[PDB]
Amino acid sequence: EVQLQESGGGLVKPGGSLKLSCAASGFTFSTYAMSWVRQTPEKRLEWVASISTGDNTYYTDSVRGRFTISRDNARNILYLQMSSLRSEDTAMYFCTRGRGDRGDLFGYWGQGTLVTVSSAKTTAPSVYPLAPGSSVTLGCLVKGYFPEPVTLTWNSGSLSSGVHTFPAVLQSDLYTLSSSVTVTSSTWPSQSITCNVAHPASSTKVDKKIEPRGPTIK
Amino acid sequence: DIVMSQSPSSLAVSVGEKVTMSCKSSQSLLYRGNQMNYLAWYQQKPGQSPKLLIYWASTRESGVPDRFTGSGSGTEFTLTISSVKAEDLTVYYCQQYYTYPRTFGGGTKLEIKRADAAPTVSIFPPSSEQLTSGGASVVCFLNNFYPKDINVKERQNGVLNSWTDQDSKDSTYSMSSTLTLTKDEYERHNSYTCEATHKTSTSPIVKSFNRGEC
């Protein structure tokens, strides 16, 4: 009952501008200090900006002047305007709420929105199905796409364990992700299995049914 | 910019044993006026956002397992894990809020120790839709095994790879292997293999195929 949701992330080219938004719910939004913390791809964390209950704004040295932290107590939203971005800004950005009601101590965090800043164009992905005992294993592969965030599911997100989605590996400005899933031999063909992939940036949702390979040549 | 520093970046504990992190400070975070320490601890299970663990350098956040404890003061703090479970796989950070430019430590990752396991291999030829659009890629899936150090492979020139973060559930790793190629070059050969060389396998474990079009 204490929810925080990042928004408006994605990608901009070096020098551009962004405005991340963080919608809150489940507390008197005004009587708490809030902050923003990014996590570099090095996986090191970095405090970015904080804002008290009295609208006082505080920033770290690397982002002064460029970033602007602001709150809207009427609609319970917290923004982070990010103008003129270096490649240091490439990171995963979280909004936080003060653990107490005195300071900016990062008690409750959102899920984090990804912000990659580079020149390469926004390219849609390519979802390729993979098909070949006692328990069979099907696969799915996502090649060629550039921002980072993609979300691969299985049968509209209904699949249990056995799934092992592997992290994306960029090479030559095209991320390449893959994933696995294991069921019983008596469980597959008879029951449909679809690999769903979401790529918000090109605004595409792709579904790929996993059908066995076909005895067709020439 | 007060600098935090954490000792052994990498660790390797087993279930039930003791764990202790150390977070050194370059400036006293203990205000005499309130006699309060301005330091916190965080846990970030891989793939998630960090969660507040310890704050005021001692208080456990409401809803934190009591097997965590935070002692130390001033410029040398510590986090104590008495009986470590398998759900505690992550990295741990220490924050200071004594002063702005709020800083986190470098972070302390910890591996867990389970019994050695064998990697289940599964190999997939390129999809029918990949060859038609140009290019083709072979994949073999290594799944569930304790030693994350294992070489897997006959000319491997343009390969990729990816690793899972060690399973918080069963303390195991997994591996992908994207043997990328083009359409024509895939048809002009026939030796497609994926072998494993493990901590349990110098007598190896393989999973290959002869090309579907033969």
Partner: peptide, 6 residues
Amino acid sequence: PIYDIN
């Protein structure tokens, strides 16, 4: 002609 699917 698939050279062993299963």
